[PDB]
């Protein structure tokens, strides 16, 4: 079980948002905290992806590309499992110091998106998603979105991706499970995209609403996210 050992070995631990939970729940406070959490989680995603089997074969620019594109989806997917395990999908467990209840969902101004995410969090339950299936679905999420006119070494990418699907095959060992898990991974992408849209817009209007973006995230949002939004970069979907 050499592959599965690695995934669990490299799984990130708890990341806090640094939230001030004595502050009354203002939109700006919440989103200035979500953004900081973004960056914290990004850092942990960089460390993880590097210790990822084969990841290092990718040309370096593809590594950076691929992480920036997937970031949201990874954050979203993991968050849904965290929320499931920790609080049984009652609330959104972004971090320990940052759990969204219905009021916070309304307050963030991303209620529709949140309900989507809460729903997915329930799915880890409705499907009895093993922790081994989750870990491996989450790896496959990093290979689930690419610029349409391809990466620098697209072939080394396609190998890696088709090999992460072989691993999921073994974690499923039965044809019917694959239907559902692949359906579950597709659900992430619409959500990632709504988040991406919201986030992007927020950056533009951010000086007028007092929301605070860490340098690195503002750059990513202004440089990579537009490509997703402009259709240059597109998720790989199993279905439809």
């Amino acid at each position: 079980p050499i592959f599965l050992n690695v995934l669990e070995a490299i799984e990130p631990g708890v990341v806090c948002a640094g939230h001030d939970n004595n502050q009354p729940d203002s939109f700006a406070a919440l989103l200035s905290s979500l953004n900081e959490l973004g960056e914290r989680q990004l850092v942990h995603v960089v460390k993880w992806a590097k210790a990822l089997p084969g990841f290092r074969n990718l040309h370096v620019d593809d590594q950076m590309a691929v992480i920036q594109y997937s970031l949201m989806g990874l954050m979203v997917f993991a968050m849904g499992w965290r929320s499931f395990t920790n609080v049984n999908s009652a609330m959104l467990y972004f971090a320990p110091d940052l759990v969204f209840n219905e009021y916070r969902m309304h307050k963030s101004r991303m209620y529709s998106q949140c309900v989507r995410m809460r729903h997915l969090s329930q799915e880890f339950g409705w499907l009895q998603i093993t922790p081994q299936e989750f870990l491996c679905m989450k790896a496959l999420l990093l290979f689930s979105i690419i610029p349409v006119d391809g990466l620098k070494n697209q072939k080394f990418f396609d190998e890696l991706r088709m090999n992460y699907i072989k691993e999921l095959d073994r974690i499923i060992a039965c044809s019917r499970r694959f239907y559902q898990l692949t359906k579950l991974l597709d659900s992430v992408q619409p959500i990632a995209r709504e988040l991406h849209q919201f986030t992007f817009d927020l950056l533009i209007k951010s000086h007028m609403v007092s929301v605070d973006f860490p340098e690195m995230m503002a750059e990513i949002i202004s440089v990579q996210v537009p490509k997703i939004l402009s259709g240059k970069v597109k998720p790989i979907y199993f279905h439809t």
Partner: peptide
């Protein structure tokens, strides 16, 4: 890019 310099250090 600040992500580039961070990514490779």
């Amino acid at each position: 890019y600040i992500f580039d310099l961070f990514y490779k250090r």
